[PDB]
Structure 1
Amino acid sequence: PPAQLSVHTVSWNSGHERAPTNLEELLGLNSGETPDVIAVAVQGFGFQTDKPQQGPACVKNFQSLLTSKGYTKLKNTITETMGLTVYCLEKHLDQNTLKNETIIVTVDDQKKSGGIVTSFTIYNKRFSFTTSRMSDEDVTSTNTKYAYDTRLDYSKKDDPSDFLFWIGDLNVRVETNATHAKSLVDQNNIDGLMAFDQLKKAKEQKLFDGWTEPQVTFKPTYKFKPNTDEYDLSATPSWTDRALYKSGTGKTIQPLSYNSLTNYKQTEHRPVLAKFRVTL
């Protein structure tokens, strides 16, 4: 069994938009890296039913790029508002110990908010990937707007997973006015604007307890005028798509890079790509 494995994650609050043609950039494969595990999370509208019939292009296009690099799709899960797919290189899998398992958590009677957790074991180490989705208006188990539920947190099991990732738009925003936020963006004072970000507030309320976000050096990923790099200042610029990590068992998880993908500009939010090296 290997000393270390690499994991790439991407999430995007893509809304109504279809999957795009250059997936190598999206998955962080454009400089020839070969991650052991890839997870892709989307938030948007109407996936499961699929009235635009983009399901088949999703499958066609992802399966065509990834199967020829040695990936097996462990699971794709879709709801009306979320999608989560996890891929792993074929060479790591053993059917007798993989114990591939997904749950879906619903918090409302329309099944629009909640999350997905997909877990599996390779080399006797358990990985869990979560995505989640919450509305501002929702009544919730936390009495906050944040996309946390303890059922989605596999570090709060009696037998916590070894490597945990939570990816998606957490419904965490920047709590200041648009003018001040845009001034801090224009000055590139990322840490100054992050001071107003709600993740620390969620953690003060004991949500996302013990979860770490890699250092953010990129500008807010929302809200943009589509096809441009111009902020739509009808919303305070915020960091929407996030990647969080933790270990339940004291394993080292080292972020290598964490960045927004500004070249993908076709919508209001920009995708966020994180790359990690984990030590077994």
Structure 2
Amino acid sequence: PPAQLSVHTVSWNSGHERAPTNLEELLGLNSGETPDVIAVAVQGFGFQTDKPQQGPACVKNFQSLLTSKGYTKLKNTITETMGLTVYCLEKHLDQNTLKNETIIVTVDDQKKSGGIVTSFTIYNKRFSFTTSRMSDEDVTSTNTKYAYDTRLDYSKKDDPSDFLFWIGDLNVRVETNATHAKSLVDQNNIDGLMAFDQLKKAKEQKLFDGWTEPQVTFKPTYKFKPNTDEYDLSATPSWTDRALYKSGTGKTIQPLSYNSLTNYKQTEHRPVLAKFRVTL
């Protein structure tokens, strides 16, 4: 029963783009780290129907890399617009107690918005990983555009989880004009631009209640002209891929690092990688 465990998360609003070749960078394994748990969330269009047939290649490439490192895939779940995969080092697993469960929440009739929660237990501590997706236009349970639903929040339960992570595009944007956002970016005034970011506004409205984002030090991860580092100012620069954490039982969770991966340049959005240490 280790005192601490490490967790890496990634999310990428990747659209139609296919898993890049350099998965080690994407997962934060390129400096020799061996985290205990890894979660990968993606948002896009048509994963389920899998018309480009990227499905088989995804499995093969992720499985090859991670199985050699001693990971077991607990669950992969895909909808039309979301994917969530969770991996755990096989050595931590006990079949009797693992209680591996996943739910999908569909909030419209087109099954396009909502979320996924995958949860499991190790050392009698329960982990939950959520991703979610909301479009600007939908009628929602919160009467906001934000990709929060109480059904996806396992801190609210009578049997709440110990360690929870929410990764993806929360549909939180920077609420200022493009000119002024670009100006703040050019000055590297990240906190100044974050003053316009909607996460704090969603929290004021008691959404994402008790959920913490690690300090953001990196520039907005959208919208880029593909294969450049230049913003396309047809959209106001925004942080579209986020990692939040909390415990539902007062456990300590410590962010180790939180960064966009600016080398993945082929799409309009940059993926975001977070690293954590949890105390059981």
**Structure 1 segments unaligned to the other structure (5+ residues):** none
Once the two structures are TM-superposed, the CA of residue 131 in structure 1 deviates from its matched residue by 0.0
1:246 corresponds to which residue? 246
Once the two structures are TM-superposed, the CA of residue 166 in structure 1 deviates from its matched residue by 0.1
Once the two structures are TM-superposed, the CA of residue 159 in structure 1 deviates from its matched residue by 1.4
For the residue of structure 2 that corresponds to 1:47, the secondary structure is: coil
| 1:122-271 aligned within 5 A | 122-271=122-271
Q: Deviations over 1:102-139 (max 9, x none)?
A: 00000000100000000000000000000000000001
In the alignment, the residues of structure 2 paired with residue 261 and residue 96 of structure 1 have an alpha-carbon distance, to the nearest angstrom, of 38
Once the two structures are TM-superposed, the CA of residue 10 in structure 1 deviates from its matched residue by 0.1
For the residue of structure 2 that corresponds to 1:97, the secondary structure is: helix
Tell me the percent identity.
100
Once the two structures are TM-superposed, the CA of residue 176 in structure 1 deviates from its matched residue by 0.1
Once the two structures are TM-superposed, the CA of residue 155 in structure 1 deviates from its matched residue by 0.4
For the residue of structure 2 that corresponds to 1:154, the secondary structure is: coil
In the alignment, the residues of structure 1 paired with residue 36 and residue 22 of structure 2 have an alpha-carbon distance, to the nearest angstrom, of 20
Once the two structures are TM-superposed, the CA of residue 158 in structure 1 deviates from its matched residue by 1.0
2:18 corresponds to which residue? 18
Q: How many residues are matched?
A: 280
Q: Deviations over 1:224-259 (max 9, x none)?
A: 001100000000100000000000111000000000
In the alignment, the residues of structure 1 paired with residue 35 and residue 58 of structure 2 have an alpha-carbon distance, to the nearest angstrom, of 20
In the alignment, the residues of structure 2 paired with residue 144 and residue 171 of structure 1 have an alpha-carbon distance, to the nearest angstrom, of 10
TM-score, normalising length: structure 2? 1.00
For the residue of structure 1 that corresponds to 2:256, the secondary structure is: strand
In the alignment, the residues of structure 2 paired with residue 173 and residue 98 of structure 1 have an alpha-carbon distance, to the nearest angstrom, of 37
In the alignment, the residues of structure 1 paired with residue 160 and residue 200 of structure 2 have an alpha-carbon distance, to the nearest angstrom, of 23
TM-score, normalising length: structure 1? 1.00
1:115 corresponds to which residue? 115
In the alignment, the residues of structure 2 paired with residue 187 and residue 64 of structure 1 have an alpha-carbon distance, to the nearest angstrom, of 43
Q: Deviations over 1:49-80 (max 9, x none)?
A: 10000000000000000000000000000000
In the alignment, the residues of structure 2 paired with residue 100 and residue 262 of structure 1 have an alpha-carbon distance, to the nearest angstrom, of 34
In the alignment, the residues of structure 2 paired with residue 227 and residue 139 of structure 1 have an alpha-carbon distance, to the nearest angstrom, of 35
